[PDB]
Amino acid sequence: GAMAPIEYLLFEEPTGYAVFKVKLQQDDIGSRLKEVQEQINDFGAFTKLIELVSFAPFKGAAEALENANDISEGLVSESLKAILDLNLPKASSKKKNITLAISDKNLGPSIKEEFPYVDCISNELAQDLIRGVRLHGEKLFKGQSGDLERAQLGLGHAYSRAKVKF
Amino acid sequence: VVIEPHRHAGVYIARGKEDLLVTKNMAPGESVYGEKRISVEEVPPTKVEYRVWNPFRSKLAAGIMGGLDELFIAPGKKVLYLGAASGTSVSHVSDVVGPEGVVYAVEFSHRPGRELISMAKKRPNIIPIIEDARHPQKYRMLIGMVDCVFADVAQPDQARIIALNSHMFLKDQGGVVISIKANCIDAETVFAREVQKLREERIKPLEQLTLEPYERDHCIVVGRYMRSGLK
């Protein structure tokens, strides 16, 4: 339907999934996008715009690779189904739908198939907010410099080796 | 042999019989693709090994030899390298960014990609990504935000590839360093059109250099990503 504000946001870390609540007030957000985009670059200002609801770590390297493969193909794994099932408010008679920022439009239909009351959003504001999570990384998570990068190293090797049959 | 610092941090000049462009080897004793290694002495004297960076064999080295003012690749930087091939140029980018930096090295073809993975095993600051750079959502779990996107893709649709990857991963005010081989896309008209496509993706051109005498009809372009739009 008509443009509804983004309420939640999904970010796929190499170490697990994160669901954030979007706190940014989005009245006439188009007239303020440049100002919001500048806020996103500063960690302190960004904390006004989003807040972590839940981070669900993968159990280990094998599950991480399964999820890297599922996400690369726009699929909803059992781990992604779980974090969305547990941390997105359920539809009710007083609040009928929930909006979720995702960066990959092709993941949307897979999410909606599991959660028909979720409307996925991948517009410029969604992309800007996701960039902000990508930028500020570990500072957003209770439990360090390198943690995510170390995990990307192992996961990138695992993903690539599976492709080339190593 | 005497080592002199290049204008660009992480790059050096080895002064001897010949003056050679070199990087400091992150995997001492290991050559990646047959390039010469030079050990310089500086309790036994300490030895530091450098690797020759031949501008005839690497588009980025050719650009550096032409006198790029801003490289955006430097110690500690995170670099998204599109068109990583077997890892020859990537190995030098890895030397430049050092232990505090990271090179995300994207290559679609499996024959070179297998060699890229193999060489990356010896360099923990390289993340090898064997995937199609036209579909950056596919590897978003593997990449953070980067300070520079370098592209040596030689594809007709490389402008869109560069754009999609910059919008997902390139910091605001980050750099774009692109090799443009007109033949794989007159040369001056092609260069101008590709640079215009960059402008349309919020990338402000800063410098444009020929790669002569190292390459024919190639042009390296440096730009700055303006996330909120060109000012």
UniProtKB/Swiss-Prot annotation, chain A:
UniProt keyword annotation of Phosphoprotein present: yes
UniProt keyword list: Nucleus, Phosphoprotein, Ribonucleoprotein, Ribosome biogenesis
GO cellular component: 90S preribosome; box C/D methylation guide snoRNP complex; nucleolus; nucleoplasm; nucleus; small-subunit processome
GO MF entry, a single one: snoRNA binding
Domain of life from the UniProt record: Eukaryota
GO biological process: box C/D sno(s)RNA 3'-end processing; maturation of SSU-rRNA; rRNA modification; rRNA processing; snoRNA guided rRNA 2'-O-methylation
Chief localisation class: nucleus
Signal peptide extent: none
Keyword Protease: no
Intracellular or extracellular location(s): Nucleus, Nucleolus
Miscellaneous comment in the UniProt entry for this protein: Present with 13500 molecules/cell in log phase SD medium.
General function of this protein: Required for 60S ribosomal subunit synthesis.
Family: Belongs to the NOP5/NOP56 family.
Subunit structure: Interacts with NOP1 and NOP58. Component of the ribosomal small subunit (SSU) processome composed of at least 40 protein subunits and snoRNA U3.
Protein name: Nucleolar protein 56
Swiss-Prot record, chain B:
Predominant location: nucleus
Keywords, in A-Z order: Isopeptide bond, Methylation, Methyltransferase, Nucleus, Ribonucleoprotein, Ribosome biogenesis, RNA-binding, rRNA processing, S-adenosyl-L-methionine, Transferase, Ubl conjugation
Localization per Swiss-Prot or TrEMBL: Nucleus, Nucleolus
EC number of this enzyme: 2.1.1.-
Start and end residues of each stretch annotated as Helical: 186-218
Keyword Ribonucleoprotein among record annotations: yes
Free-text description of this protein's post-translational modifications in UniProt: Methylated by HMT1, forming asymmetric dimethylarginines (DMA) within a domain referred to as an RGG box, made up of repeated Gly-Gly dipeptides interspersed with Arg and aromatic residues.
Keyword check for Endoplasmic reticulum: no
Residue(s) of cross-link: Glycyl lysine isopeptide (Lys-Gly) (interchain with G-Cter in ubiquitin): 59
BP term (GO), one: regulation of transcription by RNA polymerase I
Positions of region (S-adenosyl-L-methionine binding): 88-89, 107-108, 132-133, 152-155
Cellular component aspect of the GO annotation: 90S preribosome; box C/D methylation guide snoRNP complex; nucleolus; nucleoplasm; small-subunit processome
Impact upon substituting residue 18 to G: In nop1.3; thermosensitive allele showing a decrease in histone-glutamine N-methyltransferase activity upon shift to restrictive temperature
Reaction catalyzed: L-glutaminyl-[histone H2A] + S-adenosyl-L-methionine = N(5)-methyl-L-glutaminyl-[histone H2A] + S-adenosyl-L-homocysteine + H(+); a ribonucleotide in rRNA + S-adenosyl-L-methionine = a 2'-O-methylribonucleotide in rRNA + S-adenosyl-L-homocysteine + H(+)
Gene Ontology MF annotations: histone H2AQ104 methyltransferase activity; O-methyltransferase activity; RNA binding; rRNA methyltransferase activity
Subunit and partners: Component of box C/D small nucleolar ribonucleoprotein (snoRNP) particles that contain SNU13, NOP1, SIK1/NOP56 and NOP58, plus a guide RNA. Interacts with snoRNA U3. Interacts with MPP10, NOP58, SIK1 and SOF1. Component of the ribosomal small subunit (SSU) processome composed of at least 40 protein subunits and snoRNA U3.
Physiological role: S-adenosyl-L-methionine-dependent methyltransferase that has the ability to methylate both RNAs and proteins. Involved in pre-rRNA processing by catalyzing the site-specific 2'-hydroxyl methylation of ribose moieties in pre-ribosomal RNA. Site specificity is provided by a guide RNA that base pairs with the substrate. Methylation occurs at a characteristic distance from the sequence involved in base pairing with the guide RNA. Involved in the biogenesis of the 18S rRNA.
Family indicated by similarity: Belongs to the methyltransferase superfamily. Fibrillarin family.
The name this protein goes by in its record: rRNA 2'-O-methyltransferase fibrillarin
Organism the protein comes from: Saccharomyces cerevisiae (strain ATCC 204508 / S288c) (Baker's yeast)
Range covered out of full length: 86 to 326 of 327
